[PDB]
Design a protein around this ligand. Structure first.
Ligand SMILES: C[C@]1(C(=O)O)[C@@H]2CC[C@@H](O2)[C@@]1(C)C(=O)O
Ligand SMILES: [Mn+2]
Ligand SMILES: [Mn+2]
Length: 315
């Protein structure tokens, strides 16, 4: 084995750079190193609240990314356009790191490595795809079994259970993968109190956070997805007012331009998988926020080349 090795059993910046190059060249991280990243990140994530609360000082910035879906070569492109993660270049990845794309192992181990390296400045939120039922169908379980073992997949599944469900910046911007709720009156403290170390329920707040979508018309509708609901601008307005928030950032839907701003400014969608599944032809985006100005600034980007592996190859 001539690949990346941890230093004294821990992730370092040189390890991360080595890992990204190793993965770019389509090589596999040693199972023992992969194992170590997973057990260590499980410990880090298990200490976090279900609602991560982050302060951004006046001069501080953060980058919010949406779905990446195993598009490892596009993930590297994000880091090239926007710089590597660091204490002065923080990131939030808003779920759906795996499935669909066929470099999910590479995406997720890279993200977990950066979580270990910069735990206070690199944030991962759970998506609907960081769950067993979805992984079984949409490629990740198959990919892990092909590259490693069923045992390794079990460990991934356990780590995903500890991913936080939402993040609030400066008490003003709430970020979650899916969206708001099937019932009125859900509070930030309700989110904090969700016992999240589980596969999501078929209904209720944990489900909604991972699964819901905005709709343009007032009210709520039964979701076309078969789970959770669609929520109108009245739902968002009420939730924001009750919780003293300005707006929400969510992901979970492909958008041709990589982003959308719905509900009169109140519900932003960011999607970070360009040319999704090598078919959709969409742009992707990420968002910059600054402590001095929490209004979203969108940065669009397009797909870059990847190796000759089809989406869903491992499903
Ligand atoms: C189809 C998608 C997925 O399966 O994750 C994929 C394409 C849009 C968005 O990401 C999606 C609808 C989602 O549920 O997150
Ligand atoms: Mn998705
Ligand atoms: Mn999703």
């Amino acid at each position: 084995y001539s690949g990346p090795k941890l230093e004294d059993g821990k992730v370092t910046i040189s390890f991360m750079k080595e890992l990204m190059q190793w993965y770019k060249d389509q090589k596999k991280l040693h199972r023992k190193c992969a194992y170590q990243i997973l057990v260590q990140v499980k410990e880090v994530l298990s200490k976090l609240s279900t609602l991560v609360e982050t302060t951004l000082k006046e001069t501080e910035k953060i980058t919010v990314c949406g779905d990446t879906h195993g598009q490892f070569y596009d993930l590297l492109n994000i880091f090239e356009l926007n710089g590597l993660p660091s204490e002065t270049n923080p990131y939030i990845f808003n779920g759906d790191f795996v499935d669909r794309g066929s470099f999910s192992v590479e995406v997720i181990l890279t993200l977990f490595g950066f979580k270990l390296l910069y735990p206070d400045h690199f944030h991962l939120l759970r998506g609907n795809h960081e769950t067993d039922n979805m992984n079984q169908i949409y490629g990740f379980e198959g990919e892990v079994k092909a590259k490693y073992t069923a045992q390794m997949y079990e460990l991934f599944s356990e780590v995903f259970e500890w991913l936080p469900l939402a993040q609030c910046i400066n008490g003003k911007v709430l970020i979650m993968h899916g969206g708001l709720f099937s019932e009125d009156g859900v509070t930030l403290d309700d989110i904090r109190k969700i016992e999240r170390n589980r596969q999501p329920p078929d209904s209720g707040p944990m489900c909604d956070l991972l699964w819901s979508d905005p709709q343009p018309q007032n009210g709520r509708s039964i979701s076309k997805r078969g789970v959770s609901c669609q929520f109108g601008p009245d739902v968002t307005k009420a939730f924001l007012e009750e919780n003293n928030l300005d707006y929400i950032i969510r992901s979970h839907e492909v958008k041709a331009e990589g982003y959308e701003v719905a509900h009169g400014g109140r519900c932003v969608t960011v999607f970070s998988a360009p040319n999704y599944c090598d078919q959709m032809g969409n742009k992707a985006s990420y968002i910059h926020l600054q402590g001095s100005d929490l209004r979203p600034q969108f940065h669009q980007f397009t797909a870059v080349p990847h190796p000759n592996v089809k989406p869903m190859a491992y499903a």
